[PDB]
Structure 1
C-alpha cells in the first residue's frame, strides 16, 4: 500500500524544485523532514509541505501508521508556463517564462519481520 500527494501548479520552476525532491527520494519520513527542515532552497518549503500532506493522507486515510513510512517515489513534473514580457534595449521585448511545477510524493511503509 502507498499514499500519494501531488501539489499542482506550484509556480516554482521544475529544475529548481526537482533539485530538492532528489534530496528526499527514498528516505524515512523522519529523515525526509529533517533534511528539508535545513535545506537552503525555496523548493524546500513546497516539497516538505506536500510531504506532510502525503503523511497525513497515509495515516489518516489509509490506516497506514507514521513510524513505518518512507518516500517510495517522488517526482516533479512541468505545468503550463506563465509567459511574461520582458522589455529590452532598442525596444526588443523578450518573453520570460515563469514556469510552474506539479510536485508528487508517494509514501510506503517499510519493514516488520
Structure 2
C-alpha cells in the first residue's frame, strides 16, 4: 500500500500545476536555452508574439509548447484565460540523448560528431 499512497499524494499535487513538456527535441540545448532565457517570466500573449517573430529557429517549437501549456491550464481550471492573465512562471531546458556520428578528417583520421537533443518544460500561472 506504500507506493499506492505515495502515488495518490503525487496525483493530488499535480492537479494544481499547469505545465507542458517537450521531450527529445533533436536540437542543441544551449541554443534552445537562449530562447528560454529570453521569455522567462513574461506575460503569455507578449511571449507568443515574441516567439512568433523571433530570429531563432527554436522559437517555433517553444511557441507550440507554450500554446499547449495554456491549453492545459484552461482545461485544468475549466475556463478560458483572459487578457494578460497568465504568465510564463517557469521554463527550463535540459539536455537529452545524443546521436554519435563519425566524420572523416585528413590523413585517415576520423572524428566524432555529436547531434544533441533537449527537453523543454514550461509552467504557466496567473500574475497574482
Both structures adopt the same fold (TM-score exceeding 0.5):
yes
CA–CA distance in 2 between the matches of 1:12 and 1:38?
Answer: 19
TM-score (norm 1): 0.91
The gaps in structure 1 that reach 5 residues or longer are: none
Structure whose alpha-carbon radius of gyration is higher: 2
The alignment of Structure 1 onto Structure 2 pairs a total of residues equal to 111
- Partner-residue secondary structure (3-state), 2:58: helix
List gaps (5 residues or longer) in structure 2: 1-15
Matched, 1:48 2:63: yes
Residue of 107, 115, 119 corresponding to 1:98: 115
User: What is the rounded CA distance, in whole Å, between the counterparts of 2:123 and 2:18 in structure 1?
Assistant: 5
Instruction: Please give the TM-score of this superposition, normalised by the length of structure 2.
Output: 0.81
C-alpha deviation, 1:79, in angstroms: 0.3
Higher relative contact order (CA 8 A, sep 6+): 1
Match status 1:35 vs 2:28: no
Report what 1:20 is aligned to.
35
